[PDB]
């Protein structure tokens, strides 16, 4: 309900409830793992080799056929089992060739239960009795200072939890303008949030047909692994519309020049470097992650006066998201051919 003749100063930067939300999401993330299964018997010598393919001597395939010893239901029986892995999760140990998983020198590892999904659902946050939640209903609000158009609420609106290191997906979008928000724009190391008005579609897929394979580790245990790959050995990717991306960049360049002088040249670059999951944007699609190269987008310039954009991805199985100290996470291989469509909402 609305409230009138009212001036209230807000701040997103000294705001709380992002802190305990960042606590709570990782907390529920760990609550979603204690029923699941460890992979402590799996860290073992791996006889790996190249996948069956017409191999290019100069480029590299990203799938390895790894055979190894594994336990059975019974202790005295050992078995020989193979699977496939990406290049980005095994390393070479030392003639012959023998690999191992990268986490197995330094951390434990947990398979996710294939029951649980990773799609978002809207979380409505609410306050207990004795507190209230306010909301700035102003159109233009850079993120700090007074807001005359406010209204209280009992519960927050729909918030879907995404995970995207750049290019925040499926988020809520602005009313009419394209807005840019920061804490102190003249400070450079503080980021700049870009909430642009119109959503812009993305397609993302892995075109490879994927068979899983169950492996019994021990008594009542289970393990899933990439078995055979039927069809053309292809490469995962994403696409966006060309002219929409051009027009939205025109809108954000129109909005930037208020802050940086009206006669100013603005261009873009790919990100400088660092971890693999900050050089890209890193998302989840159908319960499987993507680290997908973004250099085909931020390569333009701007002057003070049917096609698409395709961009290639990479697929890792084991992660350490939020960069924990000994905690890792395996991701199960999923069937079929996966694609998903998301509305790109903002930029960082």
């Amino acid at each position, epitope marked *: 309900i609305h409230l009138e003749n009212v001036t209230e100063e807000f701040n997103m930067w000294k705001n709380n409830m992002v802190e305990q939300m960042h606590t709570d999401i990782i907390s529920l993330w760990d609550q979603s793992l204690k029923p699941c299964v460890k992979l402590t018997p799996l860290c073992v010598t791996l006889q790996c080799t190249n996948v*069956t*393919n*017409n191999i290019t001597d100069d*480029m590299r395939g990203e799938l390895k056929n790894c055979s190894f010893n594994m336990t059975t239901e019974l202790r005295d029986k050992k078995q020989k089992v193979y699977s496939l892995f990406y290049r980005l999760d095994v390393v070479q140990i030392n003639s012959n060739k023998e690999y191992r998983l990268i986490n197995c020198n330094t951390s434990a590892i947990t398979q996710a239960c294939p029951k649980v999904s990773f799609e978002p659902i809207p979380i409505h946050y609410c306050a207990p009795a004795g507190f209230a939640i306010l909301k700035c209903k102003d159109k233009k609000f850079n993120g700090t200072g007074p807001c005359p158009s406010v209204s209280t609420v009992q519960c927050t609106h729909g918030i879907k939890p995404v995970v995207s290191t750049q290019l925040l997906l499926n988020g809520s979008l602005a009313e009419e303008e394209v807005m840019i928000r920061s804490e102190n724009i003249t400070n450079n190391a503080k980021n700049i949030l870009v909430q642009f008005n119109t959503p812009v579609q993305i397609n993302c897929t892995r*075109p490879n*047909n994927n068979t899983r394979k169950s492996i019994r580790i021990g008594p009542g245990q289970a393990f899933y692994a990439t078995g055979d790959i*039927i*069809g*053309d*050995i*292809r*490469q995962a*990717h994403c696409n966006v519309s060309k002219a929409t991306w051009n027009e939205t960049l025109g809108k954000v360049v129109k909005q930037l020049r208020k802050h940086f002088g009206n006669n100013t040249i603005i261009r873009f670059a790919n990100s400088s470097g660092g971890d693999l999951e900050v050089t890209t944007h890193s998302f989840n699609c159908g319960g499987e992650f993507f680290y997908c190269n973004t250099s085909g987008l931020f390569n333009s310039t701007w002057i003070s006066n049917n096609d698409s954009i*395709t961009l*290639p991805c990479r697929i890792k199985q084991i992660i350490n998201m939020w960069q924990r100290i000994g905690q890792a996470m395996y991701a199960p291989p999923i069937q079929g051919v996966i694609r998903c469509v998301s509305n790109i909402t903002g930029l960082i």
Partner: antibody
Amino acid sequence: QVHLQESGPGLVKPSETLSLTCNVSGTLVRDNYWSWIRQPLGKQPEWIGYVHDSGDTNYNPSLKSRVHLSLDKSKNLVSLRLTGVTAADSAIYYCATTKHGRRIYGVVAFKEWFTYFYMDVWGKGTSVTVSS
Amino acid sequence: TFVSVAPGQTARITCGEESLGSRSVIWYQQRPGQAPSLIIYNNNDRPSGIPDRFSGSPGSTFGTTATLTITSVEAGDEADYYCHIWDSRRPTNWVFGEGTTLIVL
């Protein structure tokens, strides 16, 4: 209308550097790819490889060294040179053009495609036999 | 490798390795005493001169074997057949497949 005319000795001693030539009919040697095919009696053929100017000169990686394909744009012929004729080398050999084509299955910019080949026309042959 | 049918009937001639990826099958035939002769140069394409009813398996099917369907056969169809498969996954087949002879009654 083309037809090709193979030419060689037919009776070759072992460990002898064999050569064959191939005459043309109408279409000059510049315009199209060129290829050689061998076949033993009662067997499937083995495509020896293809030759064309400007780097289009790949060989069968079976032998890959003791065979040398070439063209004659001055005389408009197709030349093969061989090294070290062995007992299994007794086979009928064929000079023939070929036509390519891009079999494409995905994103072209990701090299997700390849080039097949097919010999549209054929030669007439020369029954090379190795003996002593 | 010998297949006999009545002339004017249908016939299926199979050759080569089972499909792994997308393929480009090529079909030659061989009359006795001649050179080879192309009939089918793509998965289901033919050039001029050769008539129809020389069907081929489509190249998108995964885990099947290259086939050649000849309906309404004739004595002039009496020639050896040759598959030439071009998988996107397997390497270059510098040799052809197996020569199956089609003989007629």
